[PDB]
Amino acid sequence: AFVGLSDSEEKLVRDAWAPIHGDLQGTANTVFYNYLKKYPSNQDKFETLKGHPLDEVKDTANFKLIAGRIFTIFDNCVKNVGNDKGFQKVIADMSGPHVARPITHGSYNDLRGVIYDSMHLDSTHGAAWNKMMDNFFYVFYECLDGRCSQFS
Ligand code: HEM
Numbered sequence: 001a002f003v004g005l006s007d008s009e010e011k012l013v014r015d016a017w018a019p020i021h022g023d024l025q026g027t028a029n030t031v032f033y034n035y036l037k038k039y040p041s042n043q044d045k046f047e048t049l050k051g052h053p054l055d056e057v058k059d060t061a062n063f064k065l066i067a068g069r070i071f072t073i074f075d076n077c078v079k080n081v082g083n084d085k086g087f088q089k090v091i092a093d094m095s096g097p098h099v100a101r102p103i104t105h106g107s108y109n110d111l112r113g114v115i116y117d118s119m120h121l122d123s124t125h126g127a128a129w130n131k132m133m134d135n136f137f138y139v140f141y142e143c144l145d146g147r148c149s150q151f152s
Contacts, residue, residue: 032067
């Protein structure tokens with residue numbers, strides 16, 4: 001389900017994300033690399049990266065564009081903490097390309113985990129962060145399941 005955050009939790013989320021907000025592309029590049037390295041089956045899902053060694057594509061514009069667009073969405077979600085309709089709309093608008101493709105919940109959840117590891121949060125910030133990410137994926141998965149109209 002979608003669960004609203006408390007004032008303190010909203011603050012904790014913004015603070016948790018702050019370091020990444022301040023270097024969005026640089027964090028994105030490292031996280032997306034660690035993701036494709038630890039979970040290599042996913043590289044094939046990106047036609048622009050498919051068929052090349054990870055180390056051959058990691059420094060390319062294609063790779064950074066993909067990494068950057070993922071983190072821009074999460075950045076825009078954090079900006080919309082406290083605005084449920086705005087938060088849900090950000091996700092709804094990015095869900096379409098994913099409805100269409102052979103990508104498992106495992107793949108999304110593995111990405112979520114690499115993101116979490118890279119943030120090195122204490123358990124207070126982590127709990128607030130996970131509430132937001134649980135909300136993100138509730139909306140995202142509702143949209144993948146063809147119930148996005150409520151959010152669009
Ligand atoms: C859960 C976090 C992710 C976010 C925030 C996200 C965000 C984005 C955005 C913003 C787009 C482009 C939408 C547009 O063109 O208007 C996109 C496209 C796409 N995404 Fe994601 N994505 C996520 C996860 C994934 C995962 C885990 C994979 C695969 C393993 C994936 C595969 C794709 C592919 C294949 C496309 C179409 C573009 C392409 O051909 O490269 N995404 N995503």
